[PDB]
Amino acid sequence: STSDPVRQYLHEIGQVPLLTLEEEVELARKVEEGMEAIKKLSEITGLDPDLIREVVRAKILGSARVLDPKTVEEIDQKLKSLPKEHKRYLHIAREGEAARQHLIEANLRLVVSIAKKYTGRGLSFLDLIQEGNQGLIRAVEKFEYKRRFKFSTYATWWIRQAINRAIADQARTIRIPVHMVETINKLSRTARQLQQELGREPTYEEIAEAMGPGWDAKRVEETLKIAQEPVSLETPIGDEKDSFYGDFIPDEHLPSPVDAATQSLLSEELEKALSKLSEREAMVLKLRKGLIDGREHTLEEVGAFFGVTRERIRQIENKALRKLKYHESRTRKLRDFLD
């Protein structure tokens, strides 16, 4: 179904026949042989094993895929110039990389069967499948056919591991580490078991005691507070679809017209108050309090500006500050701004 992404994907993975026991072993053996062959090629030519694998992979995947091609072609010729005995490993590597793609493609039904059990936990069905596919790619690399265990036995561990980790890393707007997600899930499981046995919602003391040593009611409450999802700003309220959460949340960052006006009134009055001070005394206070550069200047830092000693500035500033106190008592024009 074109309009249904899931049906379209299921149709595509249904075009690859399932591997038989004989077919699966041959593909796995070729993958293992190719990896070993690449190791020998690196030893023979001294090239990085990662570099050789990328070149071999690039040639198998063909020109339908976007290290630039010029370097890929150059190294490819260098491999093709090896002696006949050394050239064989290149043939084995090419067959190994081709087999790896087929082995991955034949097991895309396995990931779907696993991934259908993880829906409703924060990720959509197609997101779970893609995270499962990444686990399936890892299983192919690490799988060992010598042990004679079937592929689904070993690949199921990696497929579930990738799907479960993806939920822990992508299911919440505010990401919570993996260890904290494990604690949260365990805490929820413990509460549900206590809830079914007490016939009521357990208190934080019941849950803390159930969890084990190192757990108290205060920690249980903190974990529950941490595990709170944010609420959407577009959630409707009321039957009419004309009111939302965002319509009731004030903006408290930008100053209000009253706040801005009182800040300018305070600055205006202080400018007049500092006018009564001497030419230098007013400047010292405007520096020691950061009224010029925006940031406070230390006694020594101020002293360099006026070439006076540190102790002297502390004297004039203290004296200049005392005078401002005397004037205010005579007018009381500045006490309102202090709250």
Partner: protein, 350 residues
Amino acid sequence: DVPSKIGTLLDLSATELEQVLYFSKYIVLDPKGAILNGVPVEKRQLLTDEEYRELRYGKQETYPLPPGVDALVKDGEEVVKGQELAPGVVSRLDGVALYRFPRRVRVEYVKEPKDYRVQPHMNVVVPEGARVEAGDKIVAAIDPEEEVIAEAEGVVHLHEPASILVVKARVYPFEDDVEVSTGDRVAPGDVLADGGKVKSDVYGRVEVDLVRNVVRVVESYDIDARMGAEAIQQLLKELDLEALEKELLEEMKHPSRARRAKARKRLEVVRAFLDSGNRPEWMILEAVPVLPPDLRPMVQVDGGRFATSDLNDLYRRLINRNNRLKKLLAQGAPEIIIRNEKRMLQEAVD
């Protein structure tokens, strides 16, 4: 947005555009001398997935023989459509027939038709009808105890294949080193091995069989067909608006009113791009702008709870899918997995 601006410039229907955009059909960009059902492939032709595999990788079908029964054909024999490969199965295509998993190897010693049973975890290491000197390995296996070797000189015969693989390809026997390796694409006259002695007689993908020491060139073409916006963007970058305008103007004089009406609608879009200075390929996004955070706030309510906008969720989905596609591309994932992620990424932007 009906009628689509991208479709009008490219002359693609609403259904045609959606099929390519959401990875349902291929659009040809370079036929590379490809023939589909005997009709040469032309540019801008929509290819279904089945057609693309036929052209790009060739024809091959695998027929599973019943257990115990022995194939009536030999290993490496060309067959025609409808020919009986096994006593109960007849092929549907003409090509080389190859034994998949010979269950039993019947080596004839000279002094003795000794028979050996092959299991799923064992593989035959020598071709059919090969003189194996006493000591050479015949069937390899994980356990050296179960390894099968030849007591003395003989001829190995393969029997009881698990299945018969019919492939439409050309087989070129060789003796010395092969000039090509598996996965290479060659055209007629290309050297294959023996210093130019063996040459490709047809286009196809070359796969070298070490066991049979022959080179199989699977008949296929290096067609350039792509899906998604990467194909459409390629088409939009090649449009010559000046050239297109002249063609539309000439079609504006056609006696038919319906034909003249259609050309006017197309040429109105072309005129808009020519006069405005915009480029048609700018309708495909290569970078997605991200809104400033204060217009999609994540604010803390008075009670300590957090409130956020829906744009952050939509942005996160696009970033999560974009990053995953990058990881898959670096891992050399199969085309099915890459196509699904590309289709998901397209939907995340939508």
